[model samples]
Target chain A: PQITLWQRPLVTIKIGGQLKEALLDTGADDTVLEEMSLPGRWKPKMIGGIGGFIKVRQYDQILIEICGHKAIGTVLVGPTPVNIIGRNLLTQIGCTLNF
Target chain B: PQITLWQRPLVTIKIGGQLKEALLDTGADDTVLEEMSLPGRWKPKMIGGIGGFIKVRQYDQILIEICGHKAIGTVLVGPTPVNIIGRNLLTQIGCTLNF
Candidate 1:
């Protein structure tokens, strides 16, 4: 059995109020911001998951400019080290992979 | 000023060939299948990333039945130990959070 794979070109976007550059993963389903990257002004309330309700904050429609493309959507802030640019916004633009 | 929060019910999916239970994060961008969970028969090719090219594999429409819902989409297999149930499929069902 062979497991297929998909790859594409993605750009990193710098968070508006943080120093982190989130990787644009069209494969990703939602936009997630690391908890540590969130500024002091924003503190998320705990949200529930299978594990339990974990701490998370939401940003309303943050401006994201990607390779000349711009869009605004809700951003979820969490406690991971890396930020992910999820599919919520990526699927809008059909991107072809160089691979 | 207050940071709005979004909370919802999510299930943990146990990888077919591994012992890891992937979390269903609606906040995640894509359906990310961790690399480590892949069986020995599947090998992913190296693809470019912001840092460099990385190895990844894909799975044809894995059967994912969530709370009596079932749908199939290409699954990206990677080396991480966890599996992510991303927004690619979550938004289809207008989920109400219990937060």
Candidate 2:
């Protein structure tokens, strides 16, 4: 009987048009980008999970500034590299995880 | 020329044996599990990337003690319910991110 989930720290994103500077993972809910760090064409989508659907492809749209506050999400290219700042922009800029 | 990446905080896992208590997304490399919180039999695999392959199924494998260290991976039972503790056990337990 032990259930608690709250994570913070690591907030700095500026990957819009190759601004490059990402590291915002609100426990990762999906929005992972890293298709070679993104910077060009992208168009693919079939995301519908539940252990039976995965083909999300979309790149570009970065303007995430935390602690200072900011939002704008859409980064999930492909080839699972690692650059997640998910949770749909961390609940649209409510942000929480200072523990 | 501004590049700096380091994220830490959020550790606590215990899935398989029905312990329930997750949150360890080291920027989510991929290990999301939550097809109703996992439990039972499963079999499915076809997870490629580059905006193409998508089909991963295989749940149950809990026993992740973090900060203290511990490992055992494989849990992507889909339907995107949300439950990611990725980074492949955060690089097999050599984690580093405290800033």
Candidate 3:
């Protein structure tokens, strides 16, 4: 199955037992989500973005489901305005970009 | 033509007489480029993102070529770390996401 992310690549993702509509962001180095509580031990890290860098809690080896496709990978939680499923997780789902 | 954006949907895009590789961002609402001199008049505007919003020079009706496909639309230029092809321009090229 395929879908046109016409104006925005809004897709449903299930993470930490929570379903969320996240933008499929290949531009992002890591998966980023709005501040949410997840049971895990994390390391503080910084990521670069549009305006500047932001601090985040990096949680490793988390299970994430995208559009029913299952994958386990890194998930970053912080004061992000939006949730983005980055290439780190995108590769696992075999997501491709084409016309 | 078909290509996988694997790990990062980085693809070649031609804009302002220059060819550059850009990340295909489904999250970005507008096409953004690093600060460079382009032959066009622009108006000041701002857009929101990860950390915060930043000011940009909005250029409308600009012709941008992506993967040899022609698309004429809005392009925003500003201080950015990397050049990103956004959804506003992607819709013009008829790009889709698939497995």
Candidate 4:
């Protein structure tokens, strides 16, 4: 599927059997999701953004269904304003930027 | 050109007769650039992100060349970690997300 940039590039994703919408953030290096409970252990990590940095929990080898495509990779859980599907997971799902 | 997510999607852009590298940020709603001077009257604006919000100067109708594509839109200047080419200008150049 091809998505235009006229609006927020938010797409439906299923993580840990829970459905949520996330933004396809090409600028972000890692996928960061809002605080959520997932099966498995996570490590504390800090990520920086435009304004500042935030502490997050990094969960590796998580399965996420993005726009009907399945991708397994690291997912960070933290208090982000929105769920961001970054390059880490985007590459696994074969997401690309085209003009 | 189609860009893969194997690496950061940084592209060279020419603005105000100066060249700079910027990220093609689909997750960002508005284009924000690092502190720089642009012609014309600018208004003070506030924009929020994953970490927090920042005060910026909004310069409207600015011309920016992105990866050889010309785009004219509002550009915000502030203390951003990196220059971001957001959806506002991305749509002008017909950038899309494809899988």
Candidate 5:
């Protein structure tokens, strides 16, 4: 199934055995999620957003499911304005921009 | 050609007889462009983005070319951080998110 983008490209995703609705942001480089206390060891990284920069914890090798399509990739946990699924995991799921 | 989404979904767009590269933003509701003086009648409107709300002059029935596809729609001219082509125009161009 194909998902059409609107003002906000929203979709259901499952991470760490939990389901979440996140924005499919092609403008974002990495997947940024709301800082949840998940068991993992992550490296610290900084990311720039529309407003400014943000510090995030990068968790490696996490399982994520987007609309039933499963993918294993890095998940960044941080204080983001919204939960954004970026290109890193988008490409993993074979997502493309069709015009 | 099938364009894939990267960190930023940037694309070439032609508007008002001028060509410009704009971000294909699914998070934005309306298409916002740099305040260019085009001979047309526009109405006042406001839109909310990541940071905050912005004022804009909306021109209806404007000609826009996105990836060689021609579309006539509403265009908003305002003080924007970047040139954003939103859902209103994306749907006009038959753009979809494929996975």
Candidate 6:
């Protein structure tokens, strides 16, 4: 799939049996999702963004189906405005920026 | 050019005769560069991100050479950690997310 920048490059993801849409953010180093409950032990962490840093819960070895592609990686839960699928998982799905 | 997510998709850009590296951020709506002087009148504006909002100077119709490709668009100058080449300019260069 090739997504153009004419609009937001949002894709459907299935996590914990829940469907969600997230932006494929090459700018973000890690995947950060909106506050949600997951069945795992997580550690507190802080991440920096355009504005500043925010506290997040780091959950490792999470399985997420991105656009029907299965990828397992770390997922950060935090108070983000929107769910962002960053490079950490983007690499698992073999996503790239092309011109 | 195809850039994998294995590393930060940093591209050299020529702005105001200065060469700088910027991330091709699909999640960002507007191009936000680190604080720098530009030869145009700009207005104060605010933009939101993962954490909160930040004040920035919005300069429109600015010309930037991205990876040797010419593009002219609005550029926001703020206290960003890194230079972000967002969708506003990414579209001009025909950049897309491919899997």
Better of 5 and 6 by TM-score: 6
Off by over 4 Å in 1: A1-10, A17-20, A36-54, A92-99, B1-99
Residues B1-99 of candidate 4: C-alpha lDDT, one tens digit per residue: 999989999999999879999999999999999988677899999999878889999999999999999989999999999999999999999999999
Position B96, candidate 5: lDDT? 80
TM-scores, all models, native as reference: 0.39, 0.29, 0.94, 0.98, 0.80, 0.98
lDDT of 6 by residue, B1-99 (tens): 999998999999999878899988999999999988678899999999987889999999999999989999999999988999999999999998989
Better of 5 and 6 by DockQ: 6
Q: Provide fnat values for all models in the order shown.
A: 0.00, 0.12, 0.78, 0.89, 0.61, 0.88
lDDT of 3 at A94: 84
lDDT tens readout by residue for model 5, A31-69: 889878678788998876444467889999998999888
The residue pairs in collision within model 6 are: none
Off by over 4 Å in 5: A6-8, A43-46, A49-55, B43-46, B51-56
TM-score of 4: 0.98
- As for candidate 2, its clashing pairs are A24-A85, A49-B79, A49-B80, A50-B78, A50-B79, A50-B80, A51-B78, A51-B79, A79-B50, B16-B62
Q: Could you arrange the candidates by DockQ from highest to lowest?
A: 4, 6, 3, 5, 2, 1
Instruction: Indicate the worst ten consecutive residues by lDDT in candidate 4 chain B.
Output: B33-42
What's the candidate order when arranged by decreasing lDDT?
Answer: 4, 6, 3, 5, 2, 1
Runs in model 2 lying further than 4 Å from the true structure: A1-23, A26-64, A67-99, B1-41, B45-53, B69-74, B77-84, B87-99
Segments in model 6 whose C-alpha atoms lie over 4 Å from true places: none
- Taken over the whole model, the C-alpha lDDT of each candidate is 0.48, 0.53, 0.85, 0.94, 0.80, 0.93
* Top of the candidates by DockQ: 4
Ten contiguous residues with the weakest lDDT in model 5 chain A:
A46-55
Q: iRMS values in order, in angstroms?
A: 15.2, 10.7, 1.5, 0.6, 2.7, 0.7
The DockQ of each candidate is 0.06, 0.11, 0.74, 0.91, 0.49, 0.90
Candidate with the larger DockQ of 1 and 3: 3
- For the candidates in turn, chain A alone yields TM-scores of 0.57, 0.29, 0.94, 0.97, 0.93, 0.97
Model 6: lDDT of residue A22: 91
